[PDB]
Design a binder for this molecule. Structure first.
Ligand SMILES: Nc1nc2c(ncn2[C@H]2C[C@H](O)[C@@H](COP(=O)(O)OP(=O)(O)OP(=O)(O)O)O2)c(=O)[nH]1
Length: 176
């Protein structure tokens, strides 16, 4: 199971997955089909339970007002989450990140790994997560996407609510 965990989800609005298809979006010379509809109403406790029951499929917006993000995220889409998570956690602690949480997503094997950085300017967070992704791809075949990213439209920087906690690490360091 899992109760309520602090990704510091923005609850002012949410995104609902719709059947289809998806609405065409052109972005940076490329085509996207958007299968999620923004809902301009609060993400309530009621709605999350419905999501956990799989009666609905809701996503929260990674990008906060003033283009800040609270988390950078690895979206792992492979079938070896334990191997992925092991190499990711070694990389993270080493690059200074000791606070992160991996959650199970809808497809067995898949995860979202949130790195609990704190409010970060959007561009900087895009860059930092890309750089980590590159470092990680040296030691593992790339079967993840990273968030936030400018590779897709701003509204595709959303994450389906997590279903279960896969793993979690916490810590603090002090030198000199
Ligand atoms: N706005 C928008 N966001 C999307 C769309 N497709 C995916 N996303 C966002 C929400 C998803 O949680 C996130 C990662 O996409 P994935 O296809 O890996 O889905 P997800 O991780 O939720 O499930 P899974 O890997 O299948 O366990 O990307 C879309 O068509 N429109």
């Amino acid at each position: 199971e899992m109760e309520l965990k602090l990704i510091k989800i923005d609850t002012s609005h949410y995104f609902e997955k719709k059947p289809g298809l998806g609405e065409r979006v052109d972005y940076a010379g490329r085509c996207f089909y958007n299968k999620f509809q923004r809902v301009n109403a609060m993400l309530t406790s009621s709605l999350i339970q419905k999501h956990l029951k799989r009666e609905i499929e809701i996503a929260h917006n990674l990008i906060l007002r003033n283009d800040k993000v609270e988390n950078i995220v690895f979206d792992y889409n492979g079938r070896n989450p334990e191997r992925f998570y092991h190499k990711a956690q070694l990389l993270l602690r080493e690059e200074g990140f000791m606070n992160f949480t991996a959650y199970n997503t809808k497809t067995p094997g898949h995860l979202h790994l949130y790195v609990h950085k704190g409010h970060t300017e959007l561009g900087e967070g895009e860059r930092l997560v890309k750089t980590l992704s590159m470092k990680l791809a040296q030691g593992l075949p790339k079967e993840w996407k990273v968030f936030p990213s400018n590779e897709w439209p701003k509204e595709f920087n959303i994450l389906a609510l997590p279903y279960e906690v896969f793993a979690k690490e916490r810590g603090s360091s002090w030198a000199k």
